[model samples]
Target: NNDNPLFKSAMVALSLKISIGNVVKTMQFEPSTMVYDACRMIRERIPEALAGPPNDFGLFLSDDDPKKGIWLEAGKALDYYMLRNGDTMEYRKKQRPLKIRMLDGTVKTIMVDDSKTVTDMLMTICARIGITNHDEYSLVRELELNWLDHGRTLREQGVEEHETLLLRRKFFYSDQNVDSRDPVQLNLLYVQARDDILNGSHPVSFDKACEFAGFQCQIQFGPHNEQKHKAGFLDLKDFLPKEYVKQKGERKIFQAHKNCGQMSEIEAKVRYVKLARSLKTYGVSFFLVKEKMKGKNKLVPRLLGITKECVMRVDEKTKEVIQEWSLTNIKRWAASPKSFTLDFGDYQDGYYSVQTTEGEQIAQLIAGYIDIILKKKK
Candidate 1:
């Protein structure tokens, strides 16, 4: 809305937050002029919502998550969510069914709006499952620890029907915490470790593979019988690594199963987590990044890897190790949405600026693990 109606023009202003001293005055927009040729300050579009009779229907920018922003409506939004000038009502479209898989192997299918918020989508699942502490849990895609962004829309964030989501605790917590007597915590830890031991893409040797498989067998098929637990008794994929299955082998895992048969389910999981915890790469999550080496100008594609032990810069294509800097060596770190910057704490005195989407998330993940790592006890 222009204050003046005499200069025969229309114009729009953007970035209004400011301080002023002297008068910078103009016929901001005179009536009957198209904004196409107007103002030193301009915007491509105007919210029909802001033509502000306050009763007229309007669209508005909001005080919500910038990553997942939608317009607020003036008529309805102004009366309720109308916190500021930027806040606007959003348009809604009908949504479809989404399936969430629980740790207990049951599935819940819920309908959600494509136009709705991620926070709402997650809360709906929590309502179905009866989870009250929302922050302590998250929904994830199979296998990796990368949780979904809670601030974006369900549809805009690339979740699809083809991909099934797994519900999990945000933290399994400490040594005492992880020694969960309950089947829920322990079962998930066992299942997750088993999946990684069998199918995780990073390489592992046969001996450790069998050890993990042995632990899994104790939980899955129970104590192995001399007669019933024959070579063909179990699905090899369930217990053996893809690395080993192609060789058409079962002798090692079957023998290993014998080693694990004595433990109970909780016992199996405890033992499984213990071994998996020390695998170095077991819980290490790698984010794909374009790294600019300290002295270099060109961006090199790298996998920035993190675990309880260290932060690693690895070659993305060949899996060659570049550098492994332990947490003790990290002075501090910072992240922008565009890049994750690691400041080497001691010794060589270097820095790594990593280019990646969701760098803030990568920083959060690293910080969370380091916090857990510092509190270690048996």
Candidate 2:
């Protein structure tokens, strides 16, 4: 006689529905089973998902959406819900999988909460690598330069599933925070500096570059043997910039390498870093951008260089600086995802705009540096 086929607790539920990872599955439900029964079964069912402190597991009311849902009582029995035909649930935890782009360039996932701050992520990252000093490292946004507030929530920062995070050293070789005695810490910084210098991101004069090359050779080939390490043994391209190589040639570099003497590894690194730090562009966050000359048609290749000292607009090829705005500069800057603009104040020159996708990063990096400068000044 009933138009709708309905059962009002008439042996209503048999199998429980759970959103485990992706698919909805039947988790065998016992008539007198408590919520902890499901919890115990789920632990055995997929122990891998319990990647973190897996004690605070709960069955949330899932609505078929994987990224959405939460919250239910764990101490209570599942018998009541089962009697009312509990068909959907979410097997979620207090912490969730947070995918991170590691320092070694690998994409690894760690369990974290959206509620945790950047500081927590930093701590978690260090623990994963067994880095005893978590303070030496920090987290970064991939492709997005600068940093987020350590106190800010991941959700508030608009961190999403598709977005990848980065783990990086918060300070450089010149910083007091660095555990200088730790070989791993020193090695990482040295490695990072080597890549930046070799890639020509850090602008160094030819002379300083020569000195750095001397020390760098010591690090690579050790005490250069006069007999074994001869003419063809050196690759100028590996040590110096292509532009510098063309001018200085192999003979000059070979002479520098030979003169390096028997420098110990640490001593070589010390000289290499100190010389590298002396560079105007050392530890610089470079944005390869095109300056809008007149209109959208003429895009001139330019560099928007961000350092702790100032912001610079330099010739990409020549390293000829066109403009520099120190932290004390009378005006400020602004940026969106499309373009970045910097104001030189209302004296003689107007603001300069850079046509780039890195505009947001440039502005944030400047702001971050400005804060540090302000901290030091005051």
Candidate 3:
């Protein structure tokens, strides 16, 4: 009799007020209803709350003590918990809003759920804009006034709402395409070119000059045969590189594809000249070292690397540095072959070891630069 559907349906239902942001909505549930049912009810009413499924979000009772706020478990019944009639609960979104400016001169706001990839958002935006060619556009954010890393997601990049971002058309080489003549597109091209050279994907044996929009831009890979060297477009040497251009000739081919879009030689040169002047203050590099971890009697050695603004810890099986730390957030640091620590404020911290004395020396130099920058702020 207790398991009968008719009998269960006849049971009294609890009424409650659910708060989301400044808005509140009423929901009713039977005593036998699970916490997941309540979540489904809310998501049905408020579609934006649908980050994924009902289980992705949590329902919390209103409380003064942060730890005391009870989280309703999906498997638990509402009646079995401390919930009561007329009580208030909050429905929190696992995703956050990312305000984006489109090239069409419209500002769009979209919700990004936790662990959602940038490509996911890109597809959503492309669908909304009726764009069939998604690859023709890129999403960029202003980092310290410089545009960087369009490949990573808002969550992965630690993007906040305060940042300014835009979805702009990609730049390619062309003799007749008018869109390629746009200064912003040319700027994007300049950024891409610098990235290709820095990563050694497009190694410059000789100074390579390209013309677009009547602009003559030269890529100088300083001092041939050096693994690490200052490379820049025109006169600019210090600038940030994005991870999207990971393969050799990727940037150049993209630049030459006239049907895809292209920039005039003149426009390219002017933008390159402007960017070279703008990126005069940017400083970034890559390095390999040993990472040491504490052990019973001695420190265990592990290899690590640095790329752009992050120091990466390489995994043994993968042969890749999958874990990374921000260079700017590093509050404290040490450079040593036996032991070294990098503290990234409250977010995270790590201890690593360098392989050789030269690796330690390089680490010291990088650590010293970071310290000086921090000191100047204080």
Candidate 4:
């Protein structure tokens, strides 16, 4: 043992083979050396290596194995991580390309690694666009049409190379003057309108109001509101109650101004404001209605698109309401990548699926309402 000190010292040396792409290098170090020390050595040896910082790019054991053989940590010793002489490790660079569409319709492409978050991407977009307010925009996947989660990595959010992401400015109702009123006041108005329809105070249904506002249908009331000739003057009161008829007058006036094309600027603005308010009160959300396929023998006849206050099934051809479901009756709901489904406990054996774009929007809105309801229950 006294004569073998040099031989014993040689046993502590660790020889490793590191490969990046097609280039490979051999390095020798003591077993007591840390993993970061090896990384520094590699960078010094291969100056052209595109490997990122020590923490971002890891030295993996096998280059061919995708499940990246044991990762080496910077703080661990070569021996601590089971790295020994003749071990082969691969230098992995995780950066990938991301395509971004700017607000001005121009596109900018950049290479991003998994270590970066969506916020970083937003910042990147801001820098490219020469804007400082990074928070004013968001990144959205064009395929899925969903906003990427800011707190998660681009990899975790399912971003892929060459995939185009839209840089959309975050919608600010205040900027559009739509949110001029207090939030409480806006909520109160929505609730009042919803309650009025539910309690039959405004007996006109959503479909009927749309028809009246759009002049799509001539409302008939016991033959009194029937249009005999194109020349005869008809009273809205014959089809609607006095209060509803009064509301329809504003719609008629606005339409008149739009068709005449000779209104004063101030008058046009007033008409625009009236039209917006009327549509808000009329529940202007789009909905999709689908009847079950023939011979499917499904217990439920049709799938209803849900809203914050209620669910409705409309005729496909006429766009008229066939049925409606009160929001209280919905037991549960679910969503998939391409569709939204609802479950009505005891009323049906299975759930209904809506796969249209309008259906997905309706489902998201309903889900938001359901989330609020759940929070209140808690």
Candidate 5:
């Protein structure tokens, strides 16, 4: 089909960058040299060139490894071309200092200066490593370019960067026997927390949190190092109250937020509110229990960061806990949503506060809260 040729032409142009100028020139010499064939010819050329080189890097490399390296190197080369040839079809640079209007009335400026090839390379490398802002002594920073290059030089000179990389790569990439116990136990704990709360039950202790989840958890507290409770503790007994007022404080209610017995009652109320908020948002949550308090006023609040634990991760990503924190608590005793209601605001946007039962759950819950509020506003 005629359309098949066009689609193939597009795919060829996208995957291989011989440039439109090169394509046109090749077409002029041999019209039968379709762009698809041209791309294949160039793709075939990469290995031929690499294999023919003095290094002979391709001969010893595995099938996938060479291809992966070629793709990575090709990407770097393309980025270099895009940076140096500002007039190319894929121009992408913001004007610096003064921006002048062009003939087309577009405010733009020439970003690529061909004379400073090394500078451009350095800039691109820095950007790849997430460096921003100009610094006179950037090359000497701990993770600076010079240091990294030096390390590479050392490796070339017979220095070892350690076998950890190979070890980690092997372990991380290997398919191992799956263990269903950990997750099964975790789910059980989550169920216990849900049941206890839904039934107006007492707050589960750290032991209970660990137990319901089917794991043995060791809990330690600040100001005292006593026995680790699994399910419930008398201090948090107030959480199960039939009619409790939600408490919000200028500071967090967790141990990290407040210090001493002075803030315990307020902190307890704050925890309840935050836990409820977490349930409202994602039906699950987490929190970091500080061993002690921090900040001025000698107050070590109980709560700190919120988080969620994922059981598994995808691609190169690994299952980990996502966390977030509350800037300030919202008090339940404050004016009701109706009382503080603006003609334009919802419960979340109004006086109602956001909370998470645990510090680890904060990140996911807050992200969810933001998404909810944004959609509601829209």
Candidate 6:
């Protein structure tokens, strides 16, 4: 007259996946089976949990029923407690005899620890109590009843839901449009230009401007507009050979378009006068004029020496040790002519040549600073 015997026989004959020991047990409905069924139901309801309006922390909660909420809350607490105790067979075995009263007035006594992980503990209790992943539940909210006095003990010391959500958002969508016009951007541009000049590119003119700017002419020119304007608008006539200019002029009507404009010509002439005046006024520091000299190794130290002095002046004004050190020491240290060779033979006369050492140093300092400022905002 007992159904268990028939069920057991059928299970055996069918070679079912379920354990025979579990099926051939007593006459009452099994709690483990009830828990397993509930677990399956919970898995099915996960979609609904995720579909809810995201909370303040941008996380979705499960259902909104108070009774169901309490049930899931207990599950989360159990999971948290399991995590605090640490994972071990002994710890789990010790907590196996826990009991909870079911909705049907039945006292469900758990005699074995099914929870191996925090997640596993949560799932196990939810399964036993007919709670699902999609169930709108919060352990924190439930803990307020008894542990409200703990006062920021768990969340404040570690990661909170709100903080976690904000950090996740920051990681996923950070700002890419960083301010590159700062010292970092200038340093990067200077270094890049220095390298190209050393590698047979030579005193990068209008033709090479776009290339050096990585094809983003606006970003390049926007920063260097004033400097470029002061440099006399890249006069090909001054740099290219006379013979080449004549041939180009004969070939095209627009050959003169490469010629220096009135403003640039005046600017260049004024710069020359300024150099003479600077030499008279600053004496040793006036060697900055020689920085513009072409095919003149005799002028190397003079130009670089003045550059170092100017850097020191700026550093003193800014009170920044790093900037001052970079302009003076780092620049000098990186001045490796062997590795960073410069050849200005392409142009008839060198316009503004820079070696590899200068370029590499500029890039290291500038790009590094740019990267730093960007990371700071986050």
Give the top-scoring candidate (TM-score). Answer: 2
Could you tell me which residue pairs clash in candidate 2? none
Please, what are the lDDT tens digits per residue for candidate 6 over residues 1-378? Answer: 655544543222212111111221112112223322323333343333223332201111112332121111222322322222111111001133434344344545543232222234334555766677412221222120221111222222232222211000000111332233354544443443334332322222333222222212222223234434343344424333232233332212122222323333223233322322232112112112123235765633212222322232112111122222222222222324222222324332332343323443333333334444456678
RMSD of 4: 12.9
Alpha-carbon RMSD, each predicted model: 11.4, 8.2, 17.2, 12.9, 22.8, 26.6
* Model 1 stretches with alpha carbons more than 4 Å out: 1-133, 141-147, 159-167, 175-189, 199-205, 218-234, 260-270, 278-283, 287-304, 307-341, 345-349, 353-361, 367-378
Best by lDDT: 2
Q: Candidate 3: RMSD over Cα atoms? A: 17.2
lDDT of 2 by residue, 260-336 (tens): 78877876776676666666676777788878776578799887788777777777776667877776773878888
Could you give the candidate ranking by lDDT, starting with the highest? 2, 1, 4, 3, 6, 5
Compose the digit string of candidate 5's lDDT tens values, residues 171-262. Answer: 01113322334555434434444454533332333322222221111112322122532223323333222222123211122323223333
Stretches off by above 4 angstroms in model 5 are 1-41, 46-203, 206-284, 289-301, 304-364
> How does model 1 score by TM-score?
0.52
How many backbone collisions does model 6 have? 5
TM-score of candidate 6 against the unseen true structure: 0.14
- Which ranges of candidate 4 are over 4 A from the true structure? 1-45, 50-52, 59-138, 142-159, 169-258, 264-277, 280-290, 293-317, 321-329, 336-339, 346-350, 354-369, 372-378
Q: lDDT of model 6 at residue 135?
A: 23
Candidate 6 residue pairs in backbone clash: 42-132, 62-135, 62-136, 63-136, 191-359
Alpha-carbon lDDT, every model: 0.61, 0.69, 0.52, 0.56, 0.27, 0.28
lDDT of 4: 0.56
Q: Candidate 3 — what's its lDDT?
A: 0.52
